[PDB]
Amino acid sequence: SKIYEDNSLTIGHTPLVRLNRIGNGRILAKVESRNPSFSVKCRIGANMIWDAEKRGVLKPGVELVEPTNGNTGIALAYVAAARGYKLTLTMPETMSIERRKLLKALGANLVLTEGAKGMKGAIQKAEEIVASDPQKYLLLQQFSNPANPEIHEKTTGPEIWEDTDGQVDVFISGVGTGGTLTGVTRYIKGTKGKTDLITVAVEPTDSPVIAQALAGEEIKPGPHKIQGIGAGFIPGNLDLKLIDKVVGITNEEAISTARRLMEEEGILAGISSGAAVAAALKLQEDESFTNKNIVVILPSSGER
């Protein structure tokens, strides 16, 4: 039989689709919106919780607190609802109403922080909360929790490897927490020994901290429009050593490519998905990439 005991167990097994009009026919797009909550974040929402349960830190009585409210917050709310945990989400008061209605519909307890302070406030306001009662509260922290890249090493990676029968030559991932890039690469280059896999990190041209970091330059972030990626720093879950190339994408290239994905391929993609595919197109302008099969993660449906 194949009956899932709860919605959190339905994560992954997302489809790999050949793009026929965008690129040379060798761009294979992994559609992470085919997940509960419509984004790749459901994999880590699920595993960070399962991991906490296995470690014995999450159990009856313990409750969750997260500064998140973007794709990870939604992912944590659905898993919390499905598995019976109280969840408190802190978020700058700037968030859309439908966004909070959705989180509340999922049963999350919302705590709004000073709009001007932005996410930096919610992050502070959450550590304040957990610090207030360290035993009662659990802060997961997607940027450094190993269970983040671990789920990609155990599911996303194997899926890419099996779906291409090992025929994956390049792997492109827009970096947010870095967990997808890190986990998939560890599985393919490490576990499967395909050391000639080319791992490409994608980031906004206006906040190129990975390229800065790799070049030994000072980290200087900037504002950009590619929601989901470009956090402005190097996350603990991003292993810079696994990166073979970094491609910077402009807000305009990301948006226009996301539109091409719907119009030319019938794939409803978010802006970061457009950015990742734009990176694939850039690489294909280089003759060394011409006959390589490129697997690209499309993180979410967008928001639209």
Dist. CA 59–CA 45, nearest whole Å: 16
- The answer to whether residue 174 forms part of the interface with ligand PLP (CB under 6 A) is yes
The Cα-based distances of 183 to 86, 166, 272 in angstroms read 28, 16, 19
Nearest distance from C-beta of residue 57 to Cl ion, angstroms: 26
Name the active-site residue from 33, 37, 41, 189.
41
The C-alpha atoms of residue 199 and residue 256 are separated, in whole angstroms, by 24
- Told to check if 267 binds its own copies by CB under 8 A, we report yes
Is 71 labelled as part of a ligand binding site?
yes
CB of 75 to its own copies, least distance (A): 10
| 102-110, 152-160, 169-177, 267-275 -> range binding Cl ion (CB under 5 A) | 267-275
User: Catalytic residue at 272?
Assistant: yes
Pick from 33, 113, 199, 272 the residue near ligand PLP by CB under 6 A.
272
Verify binding: residue 267, Cl ion, rule CB under 5 A: yes
Q: Which stretch binds its own copies (CB under 8 A): 82-90, 134-142, 190-198, 227-235?
A: 82-90
d(CA 144, CA 151): 13
Residue 227 in contact with residue 207, Cβ under 8 Å? no
Interaction of residue 90 with its own copies, rule CB under 8 A: no
Q: Which of 143, 75, 62 is nearest to 103 (CA)?
A: 75
Cβ-based nearer residue to its own copies, 117 or 154: 154
CB-wise, 229 or 283, nearer to ligand PLP? 229
- Show the tokens assigned to 300: 């979410």
Q: Which residues contact 202 (CB under 8 A, 6 or more apart)?
A: 172, 173, 174, 175, 229, 246, 247, 248, 249, 275, 276, 279
Vertex 79 angle, CA 77 and 83, to 5° = 120
Please choose which of Cl ion, its own copies, ligand PLP, none residue 106 contacts, taking the beta carbon within 5 to 8 angstroms, the exact cut-off set by kind: its own copies
**Two tokens at 129?**
């909360």
268 touching Cl ion, by CB under 5 A: yes
From 30-38, 104-112, 113-121, 189-197, give the range in contact with Cl ion by CB under 5 A.
Answer: 30-38
Q: Which of 268, 180, 272 is nearest to 228 (CA)?
A: 272
86 contacts 80 by C-beta, under 8 angstroms? yes
Cβ–Cβ < 8 Å for 281, 293: no
Q: Which is nearer to ligand PLP, 71 or 113 (CB)?
A: 71
Identified catalytic residue from 33, 39, 173, 272 = 272
49 binds, options Cl ion, ligand PLP, its own copies, none, Cβ within 5 to 8 A by partner type = none
Q: Among the candidate windows 17-25, 123-131, 134-142, 211-219, which touches its own copies by CB under 8 A?
A: 17-25
- The three-state (H, E, C) secondary structure of 122-159, written as one string: HHHHHHHHHHHCCCCEEECCCCCCCHHHHHHHHHHHHH
- When asked if residue 229 is in the footprint of ligand PLP (CB under 6 A), the reply is yes
Closest C-alpha to 123, from 215, 223, 33, 233? 233
Q: Is 241 a catalytic residue?
A: no
Residues 242-261: x where in contact with its own copies by CB under 8 A, - otherwise, as a string: -----------------x--
Known binding-site positions: 7, 34, 71, 176-180, 268, 272
Residues with a known catalytic role: 41, 272
Known binding-site positions for pyridoxal 5'-phosphate: 71, 176-180, 272
Site residues, ligand PLP (CB under 6 A): 39-41, 70-71, 174-181, 227-229, 270, 272, 299-300
